[PDB]
Design a protein around this motif. Structure first.
Motif, short mmCIF file in Angstrom:
data_model
loop_
_atom_site.label_atom_id
_atom_site.label_comp_id
_atom_site.label_asym_id
_atom_site.label_seq_id
_atom_site.Cartn_x
_atom_site.Cartn_y
_atom_site.Cartn_z
N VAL A 67 46.91 -33.44 53.72
CA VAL A 67 47.20 -32.05 54.06
C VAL A 67 47.73 -31.30 52.84
N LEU A 68 46.84 -31.14 51.87
CA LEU A 68 47.16 -30.48 50.61
C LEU A 68 47.66 -29.07 50.87
N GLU A 69 48.84 -28.77 50.36
CA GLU A 69 49.43 -27.46 50.55
C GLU A 69 49.68 -26.78 49.21
N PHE A 70 48.81 -25.84 48.87
CA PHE A 70 48.96 -25.07 47.64
C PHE A 70 49.70 -23.78 47.94
N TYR A 71 50.39 -23.24 46.95
CA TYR A 71 51.13 -22.01 47.13
C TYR A 71 51.34 -21.29 45.80
N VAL A 72 51.45 -19.97 45.87
CA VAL A 72 51.76 -19.13 44.71
C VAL A 72 52.95 -18.25 45.05
N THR A 73 53.75 -17.89 44.07
CA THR A 73 54.92 -17.05 44.32
C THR A 73 54.77 -15.67 43.70
N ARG A 74 55.78 -14.84 43.92
CA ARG A 74 55.84 -13.52 43.33
C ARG A 74 57.31 -13.15 43.12
N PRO A 75 57.63 -12.38 42.06
CA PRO A 75 58.99 -11.92 41.81
C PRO A 75 59.36 -10.72 42.67
N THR A 76 60.66 -10.58 42.92
CA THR A 76 61.17 -9.42 43.62
C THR A 76 61.36 -8.27 42.64
N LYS A 77 61.74 -8.62 41.42
CA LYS A 77 61.87 -7.67 40.33
C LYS A 77 60.97 -8.09 39.18
N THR A 78 60.56 -7.13 38.37
CA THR A 78 59.60 -7.39 37.30
C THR A 78 60.29 -7.82 36.01
N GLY A 79 60.74 -9.07 35.97
CA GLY A 79 61.32 -9.61 34.76
C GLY A 79 62.73 -10.12 34.95
N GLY A 80 63.39 -9.66 36.00
CA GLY A 80 64.75 -10.08 36.26
C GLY A 80 64.85 -11.00 37.46
N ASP A 81 65.47 -10.50 38.53
CA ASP A 81 65.60 -11.26 39.77
C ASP A 81 64.22 -11.50 40.37
N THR A 82 63.72 -12.71 40.24
CA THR A 82 62.38 -13.02 40.69
C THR A 82 62.40 -13.99 41.88
N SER A 83 62.38 -13.46 43.10
CA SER A 83 62.42 -14.30 44.29
C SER A 83 61.77 -13.61 45.51
N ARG A 84 60.54 -13.14 45.35
CA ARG A 84 59.80 -12.58 46.48
C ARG A 84 59.08 -13.71 47.23
N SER A 85 58.39 -13.36 48.31
CA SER A 85 57.72 -14.33 49.16
C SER A 85 56.59 -15.07 48.42
N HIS A 86 56.17 -16.20 49.00
CA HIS A 86 55.04 -16.96 48.48
C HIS A 86 53.76 -16.23 48.84
#
Length: 182
Positions: free
Chosen positions: A36-55
């Motif tokens: 059950v291969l589970e691939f994922y990509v992320t995204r930042p909440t801020k552009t260069g600083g606080d980076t913790s948006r949803s997958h």
């Protein structure tokens, strides 16, 4: 040149959206327990600083090894999208990605050619296709990339023996918590 699949110093691949064209990713599992291969990509909440948006996107593959898979779709993969930048809505689509060989060897690769979209090519070594090698089928995620788009494939029993990404995409500016040597 920073445009060649270079050995990534992590367990998962890491790119920053502002770096290069961002050719493509390539992660090798080569050995799992159930699959059950589970691939994922992320995204930042801020552009260069606080980076913790949803997958922003995930790709889960159902094989005929892992128990609890659709007998109708055993050997295929599903794409999931999370409400990020060019999302604003979960998009879930079944796609034709054959992974049904018990061969344990499998790879997840993803490319962002335009820099505002992410497409993935699901590689898998089939036991009947072993003479040809890995299979490659494209799946468009419909998700867009950003200054922190770190990728990874996880699965029970899967140990990433080799981790590759384009040397321009090998932007390791993440936290070591994503399984990565800094």
């Amino acid at each position: 040149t920073f445009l060649e699949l270079v050995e990534v110093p992590c367990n998962s691949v890491h790119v920053q959206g502002v770096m290069t064209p961002n050719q493509m990713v390539k992660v090798t599992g080569a050995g799992w327990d159930n699959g059950v291969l589970e691939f994922y990509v992320t995204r930042p909440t801020k552009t260069g600083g606080d980076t913790s948006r949803s997958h922003l996107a995930s790709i889960m593959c159902y094989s005929k090894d892992i128990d609890g898979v659709p007998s109708d779709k055993a050997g295929k993969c599903f794409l999931k999208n999370f409400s990020g930048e060019d999302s604003s809505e979960i998009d879930e689509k079944e796609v034709s990605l054959p992974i049904k060989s018990h061969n344990d060897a499998f790879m997840f690769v993803c490319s962002s050619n335009d820099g505002s979209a992410l497409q993935c090519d699901v590689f898998a070594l089939d036991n009947t296709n072993s003479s040809d090698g890995w299979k490659v089928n494209t799946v468009d995620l419909g998700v867009s990339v950003s200054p922190d788009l770190a990728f990874g494939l996880t699965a029970d029993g899967v140990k990433v023996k080799k981790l590759y990404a384009s040397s321009g995409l090998t932007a390791i500016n993440d936290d070591p918590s994503l399984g990565c040597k800094a």
